[PDB]
Amino acid sequence: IIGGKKSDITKEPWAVGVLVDEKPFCGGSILTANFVITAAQCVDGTKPSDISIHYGSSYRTTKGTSVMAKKIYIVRYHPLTMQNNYAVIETEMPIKLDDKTTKKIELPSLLYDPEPDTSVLVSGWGSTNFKSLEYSGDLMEANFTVVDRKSCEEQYKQIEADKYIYDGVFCAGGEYDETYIGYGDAGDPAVQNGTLVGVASYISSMPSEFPSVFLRVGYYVLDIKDIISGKVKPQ
Ligand SMILES: [Zn+2]
Ligand SMILES: [Zn+2]
Ligand SMILES: [Zn+2]
Ligand SMILES: [Zn+2]
Ligand SMILES: [Zn+2]
Ligand SMILES: [Zn+2]
Ligand SMILES: [Zn+2]
Ligand SMILES: [Zn+2]
């Protein structure tokens, strides 16, 4: 996270690390003791045994508990437009919730759409400046100001990138806050009123000065609940 500050896992006990064998780090969020949600770009086409979930720690890779993935659920991820950029990971063993450092985050109401000028709380271990691709050892947090979807699309259209902006995402941060999703921050939870309203995307082709992009969880709540009910085949 660029332009945030050092946090603590007790401030965002839903946040987890998603370690992917020989691939980029991502963040994630606890939905239930058995399910974690992250970005699709993190785990698309990756075997579950190559994926670890790191929970209950402020640190990126150490001092918590690690649990292997069992199944990966992807629902029509389109890497070209980054449409439907979410994945649900089922753990091999249950996550030990403790209402201190490890807690589930509630899903939002159907089609929830954060209002422009409101703020979402985002937390993760991605890069903390735009020159470095190195991850943060410490959990960082920031409030990202929500940018109107149309206005964000118009901005992205300037560099012909408007294809990344659609109803299934919302935009937050950017020049107004000087606050951005960094490399490694894909999958980071975005929280509003004690519910998970967004899941961070990372668009490698995008420079700074544009708002960051977040999966609109509301748009996909039926899909998330279908996955959790066992009504969706794993990858
Ligand atoms: Zn589709
Ligand atoms: Zn499609
Ligand atoms: Zn449009
Ligand atoms: Zn539109
Ligand atoms: Zn639209
Ligand atoms: Zn600037
Ligand atoms: Zn759907
Ligand atoms: Zn869908």
DSSP character at residue 231: -
Residue 197's identity, in one-letter code, is V
Residue 32's identity, in one-letter code, is T
β-bridge pairing 15-20 and 26-30: antiparallel
Please indicate if the annotation marks 209 as binding a ligand.
no
The helix/strand count (H/E) of the chain reads as 3, 13
**What are the residues whose beta carbon lies below 5 Å from ligand 2 (ion)?**
76
What is the torsional sign of CA 140, 145, 149, 152? negative
Query: Where does the chain hold its CATH 2.40.10.10 domain(s)?
Result: 1-12+105-216, 13-104+217-235
What's the CATH class of domain 13-104+217-235?
mainly beta
Distance 135 CA to ligand 1 centre (A): 31
Write the DSSP string, 41-74.
HHHTT--GGGEEEEES-SBSSSSSEEEEEEEEEE
Distance 83 CA to ligand 2 centre (A): 7
- Could you identify the residue written with the tokens 């990126």? 60
Alpha-carbon distance of 102 to 47, in angstroms, equals 25
Write the DSSP string, 1-13.
-BT-EE--TTTST
Is 190 in a helix, a strand, or coil? strand
Q: Single out the residue of 180, 178, 184, 188 nearest to residue 215, CA to CA.
A: 188
CA 197 remoteness from chain centre = 10
Distance 152 CA to ligand 4 centre (A): 9
Is 73 in a helix, a strand, or coil? strand
Q: Which CATH fold would you assign to the domain 1-12+105-216?
A: Thrombin, subunit H (2.40.10)
